[PDB]
Design a protein around this ligand. Structure first.
Ligand SMILES: [Ca+2]
Length: 175
């Protein structure tokens, strides 16, 4: 968490002409991320790309997660499509974040399309994903799809939790 010291060292090595690499950039972006200094993280990301250092799934996850937590879904989505253009395969954390973000933003139909997509690519959904979708579907009256998803997660052995049930029972209750 001694991030200000980390950044000084970063500059220093650059002044000395010791070339930073992906672990350097990732550690810093990741740190800046956790500290909520997202814009500085993104500036570093730009610079890294300008220098030809190739980012990887950890870098993208951090930024997408930070952007998602901040409601900045359009930029998150831009990064998501970029990492795919570069052959950097998204992971469960990536999808879970976006589906969350899109859910929170009530962009439910888009959340469901990402869900469809992640299964095509063989990324396995987990309880947070199913919860987000089932909650979103339930809040919107769409109870039969909610129940389809509920049945599906049980088939896959993704075990539902209290919020899952509470949502569906709520929906079935006042509907
Ligand atoms: Ca782009």
């Amino acid at each position: 968490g001694r991030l200000e010291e980390a950044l000084e060292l970063f500059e220093e090595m650059k002044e000395k002409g010791i070339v930073p690499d992906v672990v350097t950039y990732t550690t810093l972006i990741s740190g800046l991320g956790k500290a909520g200094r997202l814009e500085e993280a993104l500036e570093l990301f730009e610079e890294m790309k300008e220098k030809g250092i190739v980012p990887n799934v950890v870098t993208y996850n951090t930024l997408i997660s930070g952007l998602g937590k901040a409601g900045r879904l359009e930029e998150a989505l831009e990064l998501f499509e970029e990492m795919k253009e570069k052959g950097i395969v998204p992971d469960v954390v990536t999808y879970t974040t976006l589906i969350s973000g899109l859910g929170k933003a009530g962009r439910l139909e888009e959340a469901l399309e990402l869900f469809e997509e992640m299964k095509e690519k063989g990324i396995v959904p987990n309880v947070v994903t199913y919860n987000t979708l089932i909650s979103g579907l339930g809040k919107a009256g769409r109870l039969e799809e909610a129940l389809e998803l509920f049945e599906e997660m049980k088939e896959k052995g993704i075990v539902p939790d209290v919020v899952t049930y509470t949502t569906l029972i709520s929906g079935l209750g006042k509907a």
